[PDB]
Ligand binder design. Structure first.
Ligand SMILES: CCCCCCCCCCCCCCCCCC(=O)O[C@@H](COC(=O)CCCCCCCCCCCCCCC)COP(=O)(O)OCCN
Ligand SMILES: NC(=O)C1=CN([C@@H]2O[C@H](COP(=O)(O)OP(=O)(O)OC[C@H]3O[C@@H](n4cnc5c(N)ncnc54)[C@H](OP(=O)(O)O)[C@@H]3O)[C@@H](O)[C@H]2O)C=CC1
Ligand code: SF4
Ligand code: SF4
Ligand code: SF4
Ligand SMILES: [Zn+2]
Lengths: 382, 71, 101, 103, 177, 153, 318, 71, 328, 178, 39
C-alpha cells in the first residue's frame, strides 16, 4: 500500500516528497524523493570564482547559514595555505556557534511543531530573530550573510556587537530552559519521541550519519573534538552524546548542544584578540576600501580579487566541519584556475535522509514526521 | 547630451554631464592635485593625481571635477 | 513552582539593548589591516602562501621497489600501528565551572 | 547489472531481453496513460523497434549496455506514474530552410 | 535484552515513597502542569511583536537591501564603467555597457541590475572602487509586475539620490570597516 | 446610485484583504524567512494571514525559494486547486525571477513561468518585514479590485 | 421561535471563538493575534466569514447535493441542538428534560453518525479512514465521559441538568471530584478533536480529512461545528463539575450575583483552558491516544464510579 | 600605506597604531549561565495527593450534606 | 516580420499584437501562439485586473503587456493600439448583456476598432474574428451582428483578414463545458432541435494556429474571409456522443422542439428590462444560440478552409477533447 | 602510512598521495574489493562512507573520477579512495559495504553517468524525471539543453521545450602568468 | 558515446572548431596557451 506522504506543514519542510509503502498504519518502507530542491549548485560553482562561489554555501543549508561558508572557507584555505588571524578564527567560531544555536533553535522547535507543540516554535523564533540581529548587524543580510570569506572573514564586527551578544548569552540559558521545560518533561513528548527512530551505532556509521545522529547512538564523534579546525582546540565545551539513539536522545543532545554552543559563544566573547580581521596576504584577501583607494598596489589586488580571484593552486581536499546538521564537508577539487573544479558538497541530510528508510520502518505513519524532524532534514543540502 | 540620452529618459532633471560641467574648476597651488573624492579619502574614488601643466583645466576622469594651475 | 530559580529573571524583553544604534559613530573603529611588522616591510615571497610551497613529487613505483619494501617490512611491531581515537562517555550534570561559563 | 557484455553477443541477447520486456509491458503503458485508443499495439511495437534499430549500429558493447539501461530507465519511469502522458503520445529542401533563417 | 533492560529500569524505581512519587507525577499530570504554568507566564508577559507598517525591525548600516547607484555630491554619476561589479556579481544581475560621453569621461550607457536575478550579497558594493553601487536600506520595493523589478539602466538605480541621505550616513558609519 | 456599488466593493475588498490565508509554498530559506514573518515578531496572524497547509482553502500562495524544474509541475498542480479569487506572491529572488540560479538547468527562471504572479517580494533573502510589506502590497492589490462594479460592467 | 435566541448568539460565539483561540493561543506564543482587521481583531471573524462566502467554488458539483451537502448540516444541527438542555441560569434552559443528561449522550451518539457520513461521502480512502479514526476516537472517549457523568450523576439525584447544577449549592463537584474534572476535561478534549489529542487534526491531515468538495461552506461549517461542539463540551465541564450558574456564595456587596454571567465566566475559563492546553502540549499520535481512552480514562473512570458510589453509600450521603 | 590610514598623531613608529576594534571589556563579561536551572520547588508528591484526597473526603462530605439539604 | 530569434519565448517576431479578445477562451490560445512564437502581445482587458493574469505568463517579460481599456471609449483604444502592427479582434458575445447590446458588442466595436486602427496607420494585418455562417439574414442576432462586423471591418479597412471559426471546442469553452455540468443533471442532455443541426466544431488550438498562420503568411490572406471549419462535419447529437465517451456517463439525451426551447429561453431575454440586476449569462439555453441552432448553415462552403493556410485541423476525439476528463 | 603496507600492492594500482587528505587512486575492478579492505579490518576501520564525489576530467581518457571519501571514526583518519571510469564503464558499487553509498551513487550516475554494478535501485535521484543528459559533466552546458518549463494550453501541464534565456555571460577573468 | 550522453539529436549534428586560443595580443604573457577548446 503506497502513500504519497508530502510536505505536511509547508514552509517548515519544504519539498519533502516521501513515497511511503505502508502496512495499515505501520510503515514498511519510506522512499524519499530528492531533486525537488536540486538547484544546480554543484554545477554553478564550477562556473564562478572562489569568491562568487561563497554565497551558494549560505544557501546550501538555509537554517544554519554561516556553518557552510565556514566549511567552504576552510576548503579554500586548506589549498591556499592561507593562515587567518586569531580574531578571524574567534569571530568565525562565534558565528559558526551562533549558527549552531540558530539551527538547533529551528530544528528543535520546527520538529516540535511537526510533533504538535506550537509554542516552542514561536519562542525559539523570537530567539532566532534576536540572533539575526547579529547576523544582519555583522554582515548585512539576516539569513544569507556572505560573511566568512576564504581569507579570514568579510569585515570586522561593529563596535557594539560583543556587548549585545553578551546581553543575549546571559538571557539564553533561560530560553533553552523554557524550550526544555515545555518539551523535555512532557509525557506527550517522551511518548512521541522515546524509542522513535532508534539508530544502533553500527547503522549510524554505515549510513554515514556523522552529526547529532552519530552522537545519539553513542559514537563520541564531533569534528570539533576530532579535527579541531579553529580555536576549538582552545575553547572548552563538552559534546553531549546519547545513550539510546532514539529521537528523544537526539532532542536532548540538540538541547544540550544548544548550551555548549552557549559556552563557546561566551568564551569567544570573553577571549577575542584585537587583531587583523582578514589574512594579511592581500592576494587572497581584498584590501580594505581605505587602502585600495590610497595604495596603487592594493587597488590592483582589489581589482584582480573581485574580478579574477585567487587562483588557488591545483589540489583536491575534503574539508569537513561540524555543521549543525552534521558533518558538512565540501570536497573541493581545484584546477589551478581562479574557478573551482567540481566543488562537491557532502551535505548531511543527503546521508541522513537516506536513514529515513530504515529509521522509520515499522514506525507509525505519524512518526514519519518525527523522524524527518530529528534528522534536521533541510532540502537545500539534498 | 546624446550619450546621456541613452539611459536617462526623464530629460527634466539636469543631465549629470551638465551638473559637472557647471561646477567651476578648482584653483590649486602645485602642478599635481589629489581629488581623493568628495572630502573623505575613503568615501571618494581611488586618489587620482592630475597634471596641471596645460593651461586649460584638466578634468579628474573619475569625478569630472576640474583643476587649474592658479599660478 | 516552575523554571524560575531567581535565574529566569534574565528575561527575554531587554528594553536596554543596542543602546548605541549601529550607524551612530560614537567611537570610530580602526580594524587593523596588516600587522605592524608588515607595513613598511612588504617583501612577499617570504610571506607568500599561495605559491610558496614545495612542488608535487610524483615518482613511480615499479614492482622491484614494492617487493623490496615488502621484504624490508620484517615485522609489524607495536607503534607501527595507527593509534585509536579513544573516547568514552561519562555522565556529568553541571560540574564544568558550576553551570557558569 | 554487471556488464556481462564482454562481446556483442551477450549485449544483443540482453537487447532482445529488454525488447521483450518493453513489448510485454506495453499493456500497462496503454492502461496507465490511456493510449489504447489513440495508438495501436502494432504502432507502439513499431516505435520500440524503431528505437532499438535507430541505435543498432553500435559496434561497442558497453555503449549498448548503457543504451539498454537508459531505455529501462525510460520504461520504468513510464510504467509507473513518474512521467506524464502528453509526451508518450508524442513519443509514440534547402530553400525551405533558407526562407526561415540563416542557419 | 530490551526485556531485561525494562525489568531493570523498572527495578531502579522500586522503593515505596518513590513509586508513590512517580505515581503522583504521572497521575496528577505534574510534568504537564509545569508546561501549563510556563505557558501562562508567557500568556501574561509583554508580547515581542511589531505592528509592522508603523514600526519596523532593527537593521544595521551594513544591511543589504535595494541597490542604488550613488552620485558624487556635485552630480556626476559616481559609476565610472569599470564593470568590476558586473564581474563580481555571482548571479550576473548587472549588465553594464560603457561609452565615452561627449565630456570625454567614461560612463555607463547601460547599468541594469536585474533585482529578480540578484542575490543581494553586497559583492557589488565591495567590488565597486568609488562606492558607485551601494545597497540602500530600502528592502521595501515589492513590485506588482516582474518587468518593473528589473531595475533599468542607470535611471531607477539613480533613485538612490533620494536614499543618499541614508546611504551617505550608512557609508560614513561603515567606512571605518 | 453607484455609491452602493462602491461600498459593496469596499466591503468585499475589506474581507479579502483582512483574511488572506496563503498556501505557503515554503521551498528553501525564503520559507525560513517566511517562518520569521509568521513568527512572534512580525505577526502574520495579525494581518489575518493564516498559513494554510493545504491548497484547497487558501487565498494566496507565497511561493518562496528555488522553484526547481521538478517542483514546477507540483506547484502548478497546487495552484490549479485554489479557489478562484486567488493570488500568488513570489518571495525571494529564486522564486520571483531566475535569481542566483537563473542559469541553473534544473531551476525555472522565476515562478512567473508556472503560476501568474501578483506581488514579487524583492530581495533574495527578503527581510521578514519585506515579505510582510509584499503582503501589505497584495492587500493593496485587493483594495483595487472592485469586482462588483465590474460585474455590473 | 426563541431557538433563534440560542442559535444566533451561539453562531456569534463560535465565530468569535475562532478569534479567541487564535488570539489567546497567540498571546501564549508572545505575539498579538488577529489585531489589524477590527479594533482588536474583533472584526477578524467577520472577515474570515465574508471571505469564505465570497470565494468562488473550485467545481460547482451541485449534483451530489443530498449526500454530503446535508451531512455538515447534520453535524452542525446536532452540535446546536445539544444546547437546548444546557441551562444557563435557574429557569433559563430552553427545555428542561428530566433525562437531560442521557439526551446529551444520545446527541453525541448521533454526532458519531455526522462524522462517519461526512467522511464516507468524501471519496478519498485516506480521508475516509481518517474520518473513521476520528469517529472511533470520539466514541472511545465517550464511554469515559459516560462513566464520568455516571459519577457526577451518583452525586446528584437525577439527570436533570438544572438539578445537577442545583445539586452543587453546597460545593461544586469540581472540588471533591477534581480528579474527575481533569478526566472529563481530558476526555472532552479527546471527544471533540481540538486537543493535545488531534492527530486526525494534525494541521494538514484535518483539511484533507473531512471532505473533498469544500466550496468553503463545508470548511466553515466543520470549524463552526468543532467550535460549537467545543463551547458545548465546555458548557458541560461547567454544569456538572463547576457550579453551573452558582457563585462561590460569599454574597458580596459589590456583586449582585447574576447567574448567566457566572455560567459565562466558567465556560470562558474552560474555553481558555481548551486554548492554553492546545498551545502548551504535543499531539498524542492516535495510537497512544486510543490506548489512553481504554487503558487510562476507562479504568480511572470505572474506579471513580465505584469510589463516589461507595463513599456515598457507606455514609448515607446519597 | 596602513600608516596613513591609522594616523594617531605622533607615535614615532609603525607600531602603536590606534587599533580600536570591538571586543570584550577589560575583565571579560559576567559569568554566563549555561546549565539547566529548573527549580523543582513545587508541591511535593504528598501535599498534592493529600490536597486532592483531603478534598475528596471533605468536599465529598460537603456533597453529602448538600444532598441532605436538597432532600 | 523583423524577426530576430530562433523559436520563441525569447525570440522576436515583429508582431506587437493587440489581441482585443485575449481575456477569453479563444484569446488564451491565440495569445499563447503569438507569444510562444516570440512576439509581443498587448492584451487589452475590460474589467477586473484578474482577467488577463493567466496571460502574464506564456510571454517572456513584456512579450504580453495586459492593458486597461473601455470598449465604448476611444482615445483608449488608440492608446492600446499605439505601439502595434497586428490587431486581432476577438471581442464578441453570444448573449446580450444589459449594458452592451448585440451590436454594441459584436458589430459596433469591430467597426470601431477597424476605424481607430485605420487612423493609426501602421496596422499591417488586422484580423477580424466572427462565427462561421455569420451572414446577414441568419436567425441569431449574434450572427447578423457578426456579419455586419465583417462587412464594416472590410469596408472601413480593406486587406483585413477575417477568420470564420465555427463553434470552437476546447477547455473552458462555451460549447462542451455547458453540456457537461448539465449532464450533472443526472445524464440529462437536452439536445435542442433533435440534433438535426450540422455544424463543424474545431479544436480551439487550431483556430489560434490559423489566426497566427494568417499573420506569418505573406501579403496573401489579406481581405480573404477564411472559414476555420475543422474536420468531421458533426451533428449536435453526434458531438454529444463523443462527450459521453470522455466523461464516463451513459447517454440519456432528450429531444426538445424549437418552440419548447425558445419558450424555455424566453426568460433571460428581458436583459434590457431588468435594469437593477444582471442575469447569469445563459449557458445552454440561449434564444439566439438556438436561432442559430435551427438552420444548419454552420458548414464550410467552397470558401477558404484550413487548407489555404498549409494547416490541417486536429480531430475532435482524443486530446482535442480530453478537457472533459476533469468531469469524470 | 600503515594502510599502504598491509594493503595488497595491486589494489592501490595507479596513484597514491600524501597530503590534503591521503588518497589511493585505485582501479575500478579492485575498488569495492579495496573498499572491503579499510573496513572490516582491525587496524584500518573506516565504516563510514562520507561522500562519493564524481569528478569529470574531459581531457583524460577515463573521463570521470569517482572519488570515494572515507572516514575512520575509530582511528580518527580520513582516506579518499578514487577510481576512473569513463561514460560507458560500469563501476563496482559499494552500497553492499556502506549502505549510505546508495544515494551517493544514484547522484553520481545522475550527474555524471557512471553506472554502478549490482547497485539496487540505480535511478536518477536529483535531476528531473524525464531528464535526458548528465548535468555535472563538463560538456553539459550550464543552462541545460531542453530545460525551460512553462505553462500553456496543455493546461495543468508545464512543457519541456528547447531552452532560451538571457545568455549566461562567461567572463574570461583568467590572467596570463598564471 | 553520443547517444548515451543524453545530448539532444539536433546538437550532435553541430559543427565545431577545435582550436587553441591564441595569446591575447594586448598582454605579452603565455599563461593561457596550450588549452585546446572546442568552439
Ligand atoms: C486539565 C488540562 C489538560 C492537562 C493535560 C492533558 C494531558 C492529556 C493526557 C494525559 C494522560 O493521560 O497522561 C498519562 C496519564 O494521565 C492521567 O492519568 C491523567 C498517560 O499515561 P502515562 O504516560 O503517564 O503512563 C503510562 C506510560 N506508559
Ligand atoms: N465561443 C465559441 O464557441 C465561438 C466563438 N467565436 C468567436 O470567437 C471570439 C472569441 O471567443 P471567446 O473568447 O470564446 O468569447 P467570449 O464570449 O469568452 O469573449 C472573449 C473576449 O471578448 C471580450 N468581449 C466580449 N464582449 C465584449 C464587450 N462588449 N466589451 C469588451 N470586451 C468584450 C471579453 O472580455 P471579457 O472577458 O472582459 O468579457 C473577452 O476578452 C468571439 O468573436 C466569438 O464570438 C467563434 C466561434 C464560436
Ligand atoms: S548583491 Fe550585487 S554583486 Fe551580488 S548578485 Fe546582487 S547585484 Fe550582483
Ligand atoms: S558600479 Fe562600481 S564596479 Fe560597477 S561600473 Fe560603477 S564603479 Fe565600476
Ligand atoms: S532567492 Fe535567495 S533567499 Fe530566496 S530561496 Fe533563493 S537563495 Fe534563498
Ligand atoms: Zn575625482
Amino acid at each position: 500500500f503506497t502513500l504519497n506522504f508530502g510536505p505536511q506543514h509547508p514552509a517548515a519542510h519544504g519539498v519533502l516528497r516521501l513515497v511511503l509503502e505502508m502496512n495499515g498504519e505501520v510503515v514498511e518502507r519510506a522512499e524519499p524523493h530528492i531533486g525537488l530542491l536540486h538547484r544546480g549548485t554543484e554545477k554553478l560553482i564550477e562556473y564562478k570564482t572562489y569568491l562568487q562561489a561563497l554565497p551558494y554555501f549560505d544557501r546550501s543549508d538555509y537554517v544554519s547559514m554561516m556553518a557552510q561558508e565556514h566549511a567552504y572557507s576552510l576548503a579554500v584555505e586548506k589549498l591556499l595555505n592561507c593562515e587567518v588571524p586569531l580574531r578571524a578564527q574567534y569571530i568565525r567560531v562565534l558565528f559558526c556557534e551562533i549558527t549552531r544555536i540558530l539551527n538547533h533553535l529551528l530544528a528543535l522547535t520546527t520538529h516540535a511543531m511537526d510533533v504538535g507543540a506550537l509554542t516552542p516554535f514561536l519562542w525559539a523564533f523570537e530567539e532566532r530573530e534576536k540572533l539575526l540581529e547579529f547576523y544582519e548587524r555583522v554582515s548585512g543580510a539576516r539569513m544569507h550573510a556572505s560573511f566568512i570569506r576564504p581569507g579570514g572573514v568579510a569585515q570586522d564586527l561593529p563596535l557594539g556587537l560583543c556587548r549585545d551578544i553578551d546581553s543575549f548569552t546571559q538571557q539564553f540559558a533561560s530560553r533553552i530552559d523554557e524550550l526544555e521545560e515545555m518539551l523535555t518533561g512532557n509525557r506527550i513528548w517522551k511518548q512521541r519521541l522515546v524509542d522513535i527512530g532508534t539508530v544502533t551505532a553500527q547503522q549510524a556509521k554505515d549510513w554515514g550519519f556523522s552529526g547529532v545522529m552519530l552522537r545519539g547512538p553513542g559514537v563520541c564523534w564531533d569534528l570539533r573534538r576530532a579535527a579541531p579546525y579553529d580555536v576549538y582546540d582552545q575553547l572548552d565545551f563538552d559534546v553531549p552524546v546519547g545513550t539510546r539513539g532514539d529521537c528523544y536522545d537526539r532532542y536532548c543532545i540538540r538541547i544540550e548542544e544548544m548550551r555548549q554552543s552557549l559556552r563557546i559563544i561566551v568564551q569567544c566573547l570573553n577571549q577575542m584578540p584585537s587583531g587583523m580581521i582578514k589574512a594579511d596576504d592581500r592576494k587572497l584577501c581584498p584590501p580594505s576600501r581605505c587602502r585600495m583607494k590610497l595604495s596603487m598596489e592594493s587597488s590592483i589586488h582589489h581589482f584582480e580579487l573581485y574580478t579574477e580571484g585567487f587562483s588557488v593552486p591545483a589540489s583536491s581536499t575534503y574539508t569537513a566541519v561540524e555543521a549543525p546538521k552534521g558533518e558538512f564537508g565540501v570536497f573541493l577539487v581545484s584546477n589551478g584556475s581562479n574557478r573551482p573544479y567540481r566543488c562537491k558538497i557532502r551535505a548531511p541530510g543527503f546521508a541522513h535522509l537516506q536513514g529515513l528508510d530504515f529509521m522509520s520502518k515499522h514506525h507509525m505513519l505519524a512518526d514519519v514526521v518525527t523522524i524527518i524532524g530529528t534528522q534536521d532534514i533541510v532540502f537545500g543540502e539534498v | 547630451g546624446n550619450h546621456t540620452a541613452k539611459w536617462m529618459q526623464d530629460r527634466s532633471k539636469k543631465s549629470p554631464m551638465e551638473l559637472i560641467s557647471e561646477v567651476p574648476p578648482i584653483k590649486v597651488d602645485g602642478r599635481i592635485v589629489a581629488c581623493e573624492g568628495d572630502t573623505n579619502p575613503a568615501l571618494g574614488h581611488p586618489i587620482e593625481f592630475i597634471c596641471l601643466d596645460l593651461n586649460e583645466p584638466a578634468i579628474c576622469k573619475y569625478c569630472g571635477l576640474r583643476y587649474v594651475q592658479d599660478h | 513552582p516552575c523554571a524560575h530559580p531567581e535565574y529566569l529573571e534574565a528575561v527575554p524583553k531587554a528594553t536596554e539593548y543596542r543602546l548605541r544604534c549601529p550607524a551612530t559613530i560614537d567611537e570610530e573603529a580602526i580594524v587593523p589591516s596588516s600587522d605592524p611588522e608588515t607595513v613598511y616591510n612588504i617583501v612577499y615571497h617570504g610571506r607568500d602562501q599561495r605559491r610558496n610551497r614545495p612542488p608535487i613529487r610524483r615518482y613511480v613505483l615499479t614492482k622491484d621497489n614494492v617487493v623490496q619494501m615488502m621484504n624490508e617490512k620484517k615485522s609489524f611491531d607495536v607503534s607501527d600501528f595507527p593509534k585509536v581515537y579513544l573516547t568514552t562517555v561519562e555522565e556529568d550534570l553541571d560540574t564544568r565551572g558550576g553551570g557558569y561559563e | 547489472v554487471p556488464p556481462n557484455s564482454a562481446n556483442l553477443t551477450e549485449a544483443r541477447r540482453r537487447v532482445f531481453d529488454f525488447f521483450r520486456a518493453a513489448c510485454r509491458s506495453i499493456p500497462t503503458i496503454m492502461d496507465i496513460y490511456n493510449l489504447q485508443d489513440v495508438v495501436a499495439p502494432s504502432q507502439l511495437r513499431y516505435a520500440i523497434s524503431a528505437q532499438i534499430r535507430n541505435n543498432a549500429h553500435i559496434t561497442d558493447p558497453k555503449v549498448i549496455d548503457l543504451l539498454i539501461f537508459k531505455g529501462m530507465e525510460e520504461l520504468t519511469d513510464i510504467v509507473d506514474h513518474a512521467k506524464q502522458r502528453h509526451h508518450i503520445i508524442g513519443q509514440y529542401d534547402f530553400l525551405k530552410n533558407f526562407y526561415t533563417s540563416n542557419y | 535484552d530490551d526485556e531485561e533492560a525494562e525489568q531493570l529500569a523498572k527495578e531502579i524505581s522500586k522503593d515505596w515513597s518513590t513509586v508513590f512519587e512517580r505515581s503522583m507525577n504521572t497521575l496528577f499530570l505534574t510534568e504537564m502542569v509545569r508546561g501549563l504554568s510556563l505557558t501562562l507566564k508567557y500568556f501574561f508577559d509583554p508580547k515581542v511583536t511589531i505592528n509592522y507598517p508603523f514600526e519596523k525591525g532593527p537593521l544595521s548600516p551594513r544591511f543589504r537591501g535595494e541597490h542604488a547607484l550613488r552620485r558624487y555630491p556635485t552630480g556626476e554619476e559616481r559609476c565610472i564603467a569599470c564593470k568590476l561589479c558586473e564581474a563580481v556579481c555571482p548571479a550576473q544581475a548587472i549588465t553594464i555597457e560603457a561609452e565615452e560621453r561627449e565630456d570625454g569621461s567614461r560612463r555607463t550607457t547601460r547599468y541594469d541590475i536585474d533585482m529578480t536575478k540578484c542575490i543581494y550579497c553586497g559583492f557589488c558594493q565591495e567590488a565597486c572602487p568609488v562606492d558607485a553601487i551601494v545597497e540602500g536600506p530600502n528592502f521595501e520595493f515589492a513590485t506588482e509586475t516582474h518587468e518593473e523589478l528589473l531595475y533599468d539602466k542607470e535611471k531607477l538605480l539613480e533613485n538612490g539620490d533620494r536614499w543618499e541621505t541614508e546611504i551617505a550616513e550608512n557609508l560614513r558609519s561603515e567606512s571605518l570597516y | 446610485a453607484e455609491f452602493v456599488i462602491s461600498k459593496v466593493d469596499d466591503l468585499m475588498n475589506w474581507a479579502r484583504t483582512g483574511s488572506i490565508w496563503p498556501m505557503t509554498f515554503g521551498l528553501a530559506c525564503c520559507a525560513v524567512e517566511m517562518m520569521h514573518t509568521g513568527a512572534a515578531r512580525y505577526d502574520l496572524d495579525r494581518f489575518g494571514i493564516i498559513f494554510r497547509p493545504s491548497p484547497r482553502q487558501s487565498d494566496c500562495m507565497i511561493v518562496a525559494g528555488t522553484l526547481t524544474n521538478k517542483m514546477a509541475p507540483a506547484l502548478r498542480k497546487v495552484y490549479d486547486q485554489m479557489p478562484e479569487p486567488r493570488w500568488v506572491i513570489s518571495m525571494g529572488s529564486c522564486a520571483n525571477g531566475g535569481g542566483y540560479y537563473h542559469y541553473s538547468y534544473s531551476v525555472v527562471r522565476g515562478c512567473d513561468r508556472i503560476v501568474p504572479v501578483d506581488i514579487y517580494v524583492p530581495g533574495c533573502p527578503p527581510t521578514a518585514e519585506a515579505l510582510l510589506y509584499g503582503l501589505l502590497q497584495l492587500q493593496k492589490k485587493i483594495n483595487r479590485r472592485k469586482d462588483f462594479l465590474h460585474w455590473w460592467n | 421561535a426563541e431557538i433563534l435566541g440560542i442559535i444566533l448568539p451561539l453562531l456569534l460565539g463560535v465565530a468569535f471563538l475562532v478569534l479567541a483561540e487564535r488570539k489567546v493561543m497567540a498571546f501564549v506564543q508572545r505575539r498579538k493575534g488577529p489585531d489589524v482587521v477590527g479594533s482588536f481583531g474583533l472584526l477578524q471573524p467577520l472577515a474570515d466569514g465574508l471571505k469564505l462566502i465570497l470565494k468562488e467554488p473550485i467545481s460547482p458539483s451541485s449534483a451530489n447535493f443530498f449526500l454530503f451537502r446535508m451531512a455538515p448540516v447534520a453535524t452542525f444541527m446536532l452540535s446546536l441542538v445539544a444546547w437546548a438542555v444546557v441551562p444557563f441560569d435557574y429557569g433559563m434552559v430552553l427545555s428542561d428534560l428530566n433525562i437531560g443528561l442521557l439526551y446529551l449522550f444520545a446527541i453525541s451518539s448521533l454526532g458519531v453518525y455526522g462524522i462517519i457520513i461526512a467522511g464516507w461521502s468524501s471519496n478519498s480512502k485516506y480521508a475516509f479512514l481518517g474520518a473513521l479514526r476520528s469517529a472511533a476516537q470520539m466514541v472511545s472517549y465517550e464511554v469515559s465521559i459516560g462513566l464520568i457523568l455516571i459519577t457526577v450523576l451518583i452525586c446528584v439525584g437525577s439527570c436533570n441538568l438544572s438539578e445537577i447544577v442545583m445539586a452543587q449549592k453546597q460545593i461544586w463537584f469540581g472540588i471533591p471530584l477534581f480528579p474527575v474534572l481533569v478526566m472529563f476535561f481530558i476526555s472532552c478534549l479527546a471527544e471533540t478533536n481540538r486537543a493535545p489529542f488531534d492527530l486526525p487534526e494534525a494541521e494538514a491531515e484535518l483539511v484533507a480529512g473531512y471532505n473533498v468538495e469544500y466550496s468553503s461552506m463545508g470548511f466553515a461549517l466543520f470549524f463552526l461545528g468543532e467550535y460549537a461542539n467545543m463551547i458545548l463540551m465546555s458548557g458541560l465541564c461547567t454544569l456538572f463539575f463547576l457550579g453551573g450558574w452558582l457563585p462561590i456564595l460569599d454574597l458580596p456587596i459589590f456583586k449582585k450575583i447574576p447567574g448567566s454571567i457566572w455560567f459565562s465566566i466558567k465556560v470562558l475559563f474552560f474555553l481558555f483552558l481548551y486554548i492554553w492546553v492546545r498551545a502548551a502540549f504535543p499531539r498524542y499520535r492516535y495510537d497512544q491516544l486510543m490506548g489512553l481512552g481504554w487503558k487510562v480514562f476507562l479504568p480511572l473512570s470505572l474506579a471513580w464510579v465505584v469510589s463516589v458510589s461507595g463513599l456515598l453509600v457507606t455514609f448515607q450521603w446519597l | 600605506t596602513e600608516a596613513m590610514i591609522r594616523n594617531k598623531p605622533g607615535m614615532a613608529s609603525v607600531k602603536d597604531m590606534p587599533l580600536l576594534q570591538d571586543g570584550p571589556p577589560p575583565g571579560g563579561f559576567a559569568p554566563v549561565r549555561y546549565a539547566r536551572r529548573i527549580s523543582n520547588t513545587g508541591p511535593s508528591a504528598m501535599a498534592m495527593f493529600l490536597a486532592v484526597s483531603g478534598a475528596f473526603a471533605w468536599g465529598m462530605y460537603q456533597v453529602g450534606q448538600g444532598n441532605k439539604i436538597r432532600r | 516580420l523583423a524577426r530576430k530569434g530562433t523559436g520563441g519565448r525569447s525570440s522576436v517576431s515583429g508582431i506587437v499584437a493587440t489581441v482585443f479578445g485575449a481575456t477569453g477562451f479563444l484569446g488564451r490560445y491565440l495569445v499563447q501562439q503569438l507569444a510562444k512564437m516570440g512576439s509581443q502581445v498587448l492584451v487589452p482587458f475590460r474589467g477586473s485586473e484578474d482577467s488577463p493574469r493567466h496571460l502574464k505568463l506564456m510571454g517572456d517579460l513584456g512579450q504580453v503587456v495586459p492593458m486597461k481599456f473601455d470598449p465604448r471609449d476611444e482615445d483608449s483604444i488608440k492608446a492600446v493600439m499605439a505601439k502595434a502592427n497586428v490587431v486581432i479582434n476577438l471581442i464578441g458575445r453570444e448573449y446580450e448583456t444589459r449594458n452592451f447590446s448585440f451590436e454594441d458588442a459584436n458589430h459596433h466595436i469591430a467597426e470601431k476598432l477597424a476605424l481607430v486602427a485605420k487612423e493609426h496607420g501602421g496596422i499591417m494585418r488586422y484580423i477580424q474574428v466572427s462565427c462561421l455562417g455569420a451572414s446577414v439574414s441568419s436567425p441569431s442576432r449574434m450572427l447578423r451582428a457578426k456579419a455586419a462586423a465583417e462587412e464594416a471591418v472590410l469596408n472601413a479597412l480593406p486587406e483585413a483578414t477575417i477568420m470564420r471559426p465555427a463553434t470552437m471546442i476546447g477547455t473552458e469553452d462555451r460549447i462542451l463545458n455547458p453540456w457537461s455540468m448539465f449532464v450533472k443533471k443526472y445524464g440529462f442532455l437536452p439536445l435542442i432541435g433533435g440534433g438535426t443541426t450540422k455544424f463543424q466544431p474545431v479544436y480551439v488550438v487550431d483556430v489560434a494556429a490559423a489566426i497566427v498562420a494568417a499573420l506569418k503568411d505573406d501579403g496573401s490572406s489579406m481581405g480573404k474571409t477564411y472559414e476555420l471549419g475543422g474536420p468531421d462535419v458533426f451533428t449536435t447529437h453526434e458531438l454529444a456522443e463523443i462527450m459521453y465517451d470522455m466523461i464516463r456517463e451513459w447517454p440519456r439525451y432528450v429531444k426538445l422542439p424549437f418552440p419548447i426551447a425558445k419558450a424555455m429561453a424566453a426568460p433571460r431575454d428581458f436583459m434590457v428590462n431588468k435594469v437593477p440586476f444582471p442575469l447569469p449569462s445563459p449557458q445552454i439555453f440561449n434564444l439566439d444560440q438556438i436561432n442559430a441552432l435551427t438552420t444548419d448553415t454552420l458548414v464550410s462552403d467552397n470558401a477558404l478552409k484550413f487548407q489555404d493556410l498549409d494547416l490541417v485541423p486536429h480531430k475532435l476525439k482524443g486530446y482535442p477533447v480530453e478537457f472533459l476528463i476533469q468531469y469524470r | 602510512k600503515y594502510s599502504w603496507e598491509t594493503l595488497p600492492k595491486k589494489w592501490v594500482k595507479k596513484m597514491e598521495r600524501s597530503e590534503h587528505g591521503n588518497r589511493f587512486d585505485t582501479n575500478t575492478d579492485y575498488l569495492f574489493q579495496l573498499l572491503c579492505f579499510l573496513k572490516l579490518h582491525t587496524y584500518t576501520r573506516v565504516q563510514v562512507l562520507i561522500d562519493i564525489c564524481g569528478v569529470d576530467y574531459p581531457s583524460r581518457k577515463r573521463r570521470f573520477e569517482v572519488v570515494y571519501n572515507l572516514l575512520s571514526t575509530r582511528y580518527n583518519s580520513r582516506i579518499r579512495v578514487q577510481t576512473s571510469a569513463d561514460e560507458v564503464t560500469r563501476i563496482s558499487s559499494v552500497v553492499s559495504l556502506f549502505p549510505s553509498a546508495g544515494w551517493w551513487e544514484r547522484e553520481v550516475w545522475d550527474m555524471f553517468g557512471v553506472s554502478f554494478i549490482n547497485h539496487p535501485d540505480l535511478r536518477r535521484i536529483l535531476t528531473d524525471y524525464g531528464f535526458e543528459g548528465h548535468p555535472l559533466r563538463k560538456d553539459f552546458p550550464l543552462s541545460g539543453y531542453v530545460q525551460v518549463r512553462y505553462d500553456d494550453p496543455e493546461k495543468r501541464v508545464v512543457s519541456e521545450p528547447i531552452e532560451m534565456t538571457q545568455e549566461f555571460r562567461y567572463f574570461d577573468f583568467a590572467s596570463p602568468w598564471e | 558515446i553520443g547517444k548515451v550522453s543524453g545530448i539532444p539529436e539536433e546538437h550532435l549534428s553541430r559543427k565545431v572548431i577545435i582550436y587553441s586560443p591564441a595569446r591575447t595580443a594586448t598582454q605579452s604573457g603565455s599563461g593561457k596557451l596550450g588549452k585546446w577548446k572546442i568552439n
